[PDB]
Amino acid sequence: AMLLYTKKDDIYSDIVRMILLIKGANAKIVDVSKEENSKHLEELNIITPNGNIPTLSTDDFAVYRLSVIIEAIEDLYPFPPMFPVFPKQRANARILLEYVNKTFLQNIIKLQSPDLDEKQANEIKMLMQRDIISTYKKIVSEREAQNINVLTLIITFVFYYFIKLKISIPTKDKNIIKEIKELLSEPNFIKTIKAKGA
Amino acid sequence: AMLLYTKKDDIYSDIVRMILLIKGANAKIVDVSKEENSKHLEELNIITPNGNIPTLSTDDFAVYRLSVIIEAIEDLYPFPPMFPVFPKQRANARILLEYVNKTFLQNIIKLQSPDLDEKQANEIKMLMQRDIISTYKKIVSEREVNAEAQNINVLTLIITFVFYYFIKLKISIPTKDKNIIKEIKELLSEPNFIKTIKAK
Structure with missing residues (x-):
């Protein structure tokens, strides 16, 4: 349902991944460092200006600012409170x-x-x-x-x-x-x- | 009792002032760019890192990012919902x-x-x-x-x-x-x- 684009040692990615873990969220998490996911990287560059990492994309929209990644998650997944x-x-x-x-x-x-x-x-x-x-x-x-x-x-x-x-x-x-x-x-x-990265 | 630190020709200040307008909250708007409000400006520079504009001041806090401002305004006046x-x-x-x-x-x-x-x-x-x-x-x-x-x-x-x-x-x-x-x-x-x- 949900997509998170990540990099292996990005503090931001680590944060959004933990938040997703604590929440009950299940999201597909893709590491764009890996070649195996090159397709996803290509896509990332389409849906954001610089192919920013991390990016969280619901089917509807895609977000890369940390604060509103956290806010969007908090709205979609209210419990437990952050x-x-x-x-x-x-x-x-x-x-x-x-x-x-x-x-x-x-x-x-x-x-x-x-x-x-x-x-x-x-x-x-x-x-x-x-x-x-x-x-x-x-x-x-x-x-x-x-x-x-x-x-x-x-x-x-x-x-x-x-x-x-x-x-x-x-x-x-x-x-x-x-x-x-x-x-x-x-x-x-x-x-x-x-x-x-996952 | 709200106090919104604004400056003239600032799109953020204008957006927020209209938010308060709509919310029916009565708030004291202060043009910090104005000379007559220089004192206010000083005060802003104490309760905020970089003389942030706009900054909303409540009895309890001061906030300055637009998302954060809309947020606080809503927390204190949820209806009608933005x-x-x-x-x-x-x-x-x-x-x-x-x-x-x-x-x-x-x-x-x-x-x-x-x-x-x-x-x-x-x-x-x-x-x-x-x-x-x-x-x-x-x-x-x-x-x-x-x-x-x-x-x-x-x-x-x-x-x-x-x-x-x-x-x-x-x-x-x-x-x-x-x-x-x-x-x-x-x-x-x-x-x-x-x-x-x-x-x-």
Whole structure:
């Protein structure tokens, strides 16, 4: 019924795949890195300007902005909730999602590209280290057994890509490290991480 | 008690002000570009990262992305509904709204930029002109496919402002179809639209 176009190590794809896993959604997931799916790649380029990844296409429409991929999924698949149920927290959450998107996710992708001036990269990593603890801190504050939230899920993926890019979390706090280790341990997260593009 | 930080000739501000108009919410609009509201501007610069415009301010929060603004306004004034109320339809509508946002709204803001290059001004105009009519048709098709038409949706309101701004930026509306012309004129002379553009 539903189609998700993905790439093997895209934090965005990983996020949308986890969200689809947690929801009861069943969607065909296609990795356009693989030749075996070249047809799908061709199609992707037709239905989006740059053949963006990830793209979620219902039969009707196709979307590549993360925020509205998440929104569309949340409308099609209401349960379980990815967002707060009350307008203040829900709105502030939406702003936060946009913030994490600007600061960490986009930058993680920027880091993946090999054209980048090494020093330039080093800046980006450094900024990320600068804001990671504070961001994690707002996300826990907004959280105030509990359901997983879209912000916590995304931040789990952020910590996981920090690990991938050999970036070390700047905290001495014991509890924070226990918490981050605890996030990285969720079953769906690992389930998603094990199967790279699907 | 709402407070909408706007600036003049901003398509987003106008869209939102009409949203509030329609919702019947009474909100204090503030033109941040105006000198007499400089204090307000200062305040905005505290509660927002980059002096974001528009920004809606409630007793509880401030929000600034258009999707997020329409969202909050709806949470606090759900009736009448801007989006469909059934999941599938509502989803398509959000996606289509994002499309109009990327293709049109954002590009209109681009064309207003004071440092605008001529090459990219032409790129943008040509892009928009090339797509506007098929986009408009997608909107009316989605409209009439399942619904059902007394009250208006966000897609139609926004496409009305896109047309209005095509005019405001001296871009010819590329159609000769007499039906579509009639429809566009009907859109452009809808009560709340005129009430919105001529009371600023």
